[PDB]
Amino acid sequence: WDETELGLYKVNEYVDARDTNMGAWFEAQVVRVTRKEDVIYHVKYDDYPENGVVQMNSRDVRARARTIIKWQDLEVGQVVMLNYNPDNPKERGFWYDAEISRKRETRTARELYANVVLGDDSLNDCRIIFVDEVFKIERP
Template sequence: MNVKDLRPRARTILKWNELNVGDTLMVNFNEENPGKRGFSYDAEITTLKTISRTKKELRVKIFLGGSEGTLNDCRVIFVDEIFKVEKPGAHPISFADGKFLRKNDPECDLCGGDPDKKCHTCSCHKYGEKQEPNMQLLCDECNMAYHIYCLNPPLDEVPEEEYWYFPCCKTDSSEVVKAGEKLKMSKKKAKMPSSSTES
């Protein structure tokens, strides 16, 4: 690919008074959870309203890219992080451009991916410690991680089995489906992620 055809990284934040209906720009949007931080998408402004000095409403048509099409009437939460779409061939980024940080969805909604903060969601579910990630097991049922030495009883080494389940998630023998039987669903299992698949 020729360098003149490459679009440089977005670096110019647009102020509210620089926006107009019909403009194409780059916004942060979360497709799965519109109330939270997501990823950067090209978008076209469809609605622009100033409700009060501090409250603004921006609705856009999101361009998903390629054959994926568009998402219509999407409300942009982060109206202070609207980026200009750079034209191909623009000068490369240098220190003269200043800070041009673009934020993406954090690794964890609770701790924001902070390595020094304890978190029971993205780290060891029992104690929240983040050290020794290579000693953590991920439960194939609840998707929570556990250090092998935090388990009861603790394990000496990471098991080689393809699937591993935390003891409270392990299927009890009364729920095992025998050949020719239909899948049974207990109240506990109905709430687990595996209930949405038939495997």
């Protein structure tokens, strides 16, 4: 934790950070960068100061989502960040990475399913409720 360096994201940058246990992405800020590509980010969460500073593998931090993909532009096989609730699927939850799986549409209804990646595994064929709040994933 004492080998300070300079890589992909910088000290004080606002980023998104993946919780390892649940697999959800949270707004966060890089407090220091050390050397373990194979960099370690020391991160604090914006809305969770009581969680302290947490060590991140570089695969678990990226630029913050800024771009919403509109319904019309959603395609099966797209990998996106979207909001889902495992325990209560009809309610609002957290932001996970997911693969769009099914897209159905009538004159009055719209149905979106995705395979949602959640920490340790993958959950197939989840009905996504928040169909207008699907983010593009920021890649370098």
